[PDB]
Structures are given as C-alpha cells and as structure tokens.
Write a protein that binds this ligand. Structure first.
Ligand SMILES: N=C(N)c1ccc2nc(-c3ccc(-c4nc5ccc(C(=N)N)cc5[nH]4)[se]3)[nH]c2c1
Length: 91
DNA sequence: AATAAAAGCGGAAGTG
DNA sequence: TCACTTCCGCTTTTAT
C-alpha cells in the first residue's frame, strides 16, 4: 500500500494541489499547508485510503505526529509547517 | 487583562 | 504486525 508521507511528497513534486500545499524551502525540506484549503487535501487523503469516514485535517495531522518517533516527519515551530527527512527526499 | 478561536498535543481502541 | 484511523480530552498560541 501507500504511506502518508509519500502521498504528500508526490503532490509537492506534482503541484497537483498548489492551492493547498507548497514548499517553504524546497531545498531544506520544509513545506506548509494552506490554513484555508488544508481540509480539501486531507479530504483527498481519506479518499485514496477508502476509510469508512471522511478524513479531516485534525485526524491526518494526528498521523503525522506519529512520524516523530521514527523521524520521517518532524513538526516545525511554525504555523502548519512540517519537515521531511533526507532519506525520503533521496539522500 | 481577560477571552474566543485556532492550532497543536497524545492516549486508547479500532481498522484494513 | 503494521500504518494509520477514530475518538475524546487536554494543553498550548494566537488574535482581538
Ligand atoms: N485565533 C486565531 N485566529 C489563531 C491564529 C493563529 C494561531 N496559531 C495558533 C497556535 C500555534 C501553535 C499552537 C500550539 N503549539 C502547541 C504545543 C504543544 C501543545 C500541547 N498540547 N502540549 C499544544 C500546542 N498548541 Se496553537 N493558534 C492560533 C489561533
């Protein structure tokens, strides 16, 4: 199956939802969600998974915080900003 | 100086 | 066993 952080990375490289997600420093690995359009993205996440209920950003973000222990994604002290790890980008 | 609102946190049970 | 999902409760930041 697919993993969460991959679903995000792909769009960031595809620009499929530029209105909902964008790079802050595409080199450093930072990205940020639109405070207004974040729901329309989490909605598409719950669709690609086929969950019983519709996916809300609050629930999706609850998943991101579980990447903290492994390092895949670490929250930033900024608003709605997270950071990928190097291994995911490539090396 | 208090607030209402938004963001963020995390345990626990549950799911495909 | 995984990778979340869902739920509820609390805590923290910000804007006004
Ligand atoms: N009214 C508004 N227009 C408004 C606008 C912007 C806002 N930016 C925030 C927050 C930013 C960071 C927050 C936060 N960092 C936390 C760390 C730990 C915990 C915890 N539970 N340990 C909780 C945390 N919450 Se909230 N709130 C806003 C409101």
């Amino acid at each position: 199956k697919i993993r969460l952080y991959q679903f995000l990375l792909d769009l960031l490289r595809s620009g499929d939802m530029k209105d909902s997600i964008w790079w802050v420093d595409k080199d450093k690995g930072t990205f940020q969600f639109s405070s207004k359009h974040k729901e329309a993205l989490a909605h598409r996440w719950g669709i690609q998974k086929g969950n019983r209920k519709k996916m809300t950003y609050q629930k999706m973000a609850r998943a991101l915080r579980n990447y903290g222990k492994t390092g895949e994604v670490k929250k930033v002290k900024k608003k709605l900003t997270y950071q990928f790890s190097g291994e995911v980008l490539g090396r």
